[PDB]
């Protein structure tokens, strides 16, 4: 099957700006390209077909272009109601595969994450479990990396990272990182560290604790 690649998963825009969303097909598809817009909780909605033919009712701010393998959806004078996921699609060969999607987001000034770390609660330890939680709140841009360390060594398995959607008020992101351990594992090791790497600092933000300390 033909692979449709949208390299950008997230794009930040300012209202009134021009934005270009790229789509690349793994095979030559002429101009058999469809673009969709999807708002949360709704089905995709048709914007453009045959690469550049705008569907009825769609504002002329939306323009589709390209031919062969490289296509572009351009949104001129972007408005707040244009915030959504955008998907390309080819119909040269069935299955008519969809692109991976590009979400439009709001641009704002850079903001460092507020990091706080939380050892397992007393009540969880009594139940026989041990989870270490790290919140990274109110940062921009979205791009961020979290590393867990136990006694100086990086720990990769047992880690789940959950992002919030962009905030409607301040346009920031927040992230939750949870290291799940067994009780016997938590009680053997000493130092637990949450390291956040973000473009707002050359050095990573480090929050840690020792199990036996207070």
């Amino acid at each position: 099957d033909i692979v449709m690649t949208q390299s950008q998963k997230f794009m930040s825009v300012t209202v009134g700006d021009r934005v270009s969303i790229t789509c690349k097909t793994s095979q030559s598809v002429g101009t058999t390209i469809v673009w969709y817009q999807q708002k949360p909780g709704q089905s995709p909605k048709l914007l453009i077909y045959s690469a550049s033919n705008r569907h009825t009712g769609v504002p002329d701010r939306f323009t589709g272009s390209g031919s062969g393998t490289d296509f572009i959806l351009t949104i001129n004078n972007v408005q707040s109601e244009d915030l959504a996921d955008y998907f390309c699609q080819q119909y040269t060969s069935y299955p008519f595969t969809f692109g991976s999607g590009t979400k439009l987001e709001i641009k704002r000034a850079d903001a460092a994450p507020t990091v706080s770390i939380f050892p397992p609660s007393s009540e969880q330890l009594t139940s026989g479990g041990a989870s270490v939680v790290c919140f990274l709140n109110n940062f921009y841009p979205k791009d961020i990396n979290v590393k867990w360390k136990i006694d100086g060594s990086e720990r990769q398995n047992g880690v789940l990272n959950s992002w919030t959607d962009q905030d409607s008020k301040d346009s920031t992101y927040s992230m939750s990182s949870t290291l799940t351990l067994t009780k016997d594992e938590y009680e053997r090791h000493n130092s637990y560290t949450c390291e956040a790497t973000h473009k707002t600092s050359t050095s990573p933000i480090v929050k840690s604790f020792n199990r036996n300390e207070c």
């Binding site: 699609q89 069935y94 991976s100 999607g101 959950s162 207070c214």
Partner: protein, 203 residues
Amino acid sequence: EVKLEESGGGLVQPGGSMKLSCTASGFTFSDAWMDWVRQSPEKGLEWVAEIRGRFTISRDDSKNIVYLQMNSLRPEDTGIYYCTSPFAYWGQGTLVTVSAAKTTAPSVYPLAPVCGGTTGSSVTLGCLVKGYFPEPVTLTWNSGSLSSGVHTFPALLQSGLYTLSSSVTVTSNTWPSQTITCNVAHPASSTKVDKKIEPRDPI
């Protein structure tokens, strides 16, 4: 006007079967291409034909109904299944959840700051909700009185059970004088829990 409407979704166990229906109106049914597309966060938008035996499309003998018979389902088949007459016409989508979990109440744990005393201008507290099924749970702080500075994170599947957390941030001169409590409710298990956040003490 064209109307497409799915039905027959819900919970089903691994290795089980489920048949979705989609009723159509506004056009001559047999003159139209009718197909199924699913959406998940992992795989994105997929035509049912891309998943391949396990997913078979059929139509009713007489009525304006297209069916999707799904067999030998796996957890990865969880997602929203859309009926469509390409390219412009889509149904609302119906959720299919493939899981072997029994109804399980959440364990709710309070997350007070590090015992050392992080202090500073602000202080961040947490509430961990672990090991529940099915979705959803509702989480508030102080009966919903404390809405500002709150981040409730989407639930993720951990093993075969859901887990989510929530953070709340306030000025250092409020907590612990002002009481802070996360209220968690899980309709499916008929459980409503209130966990007060209290400072940690030495072991």
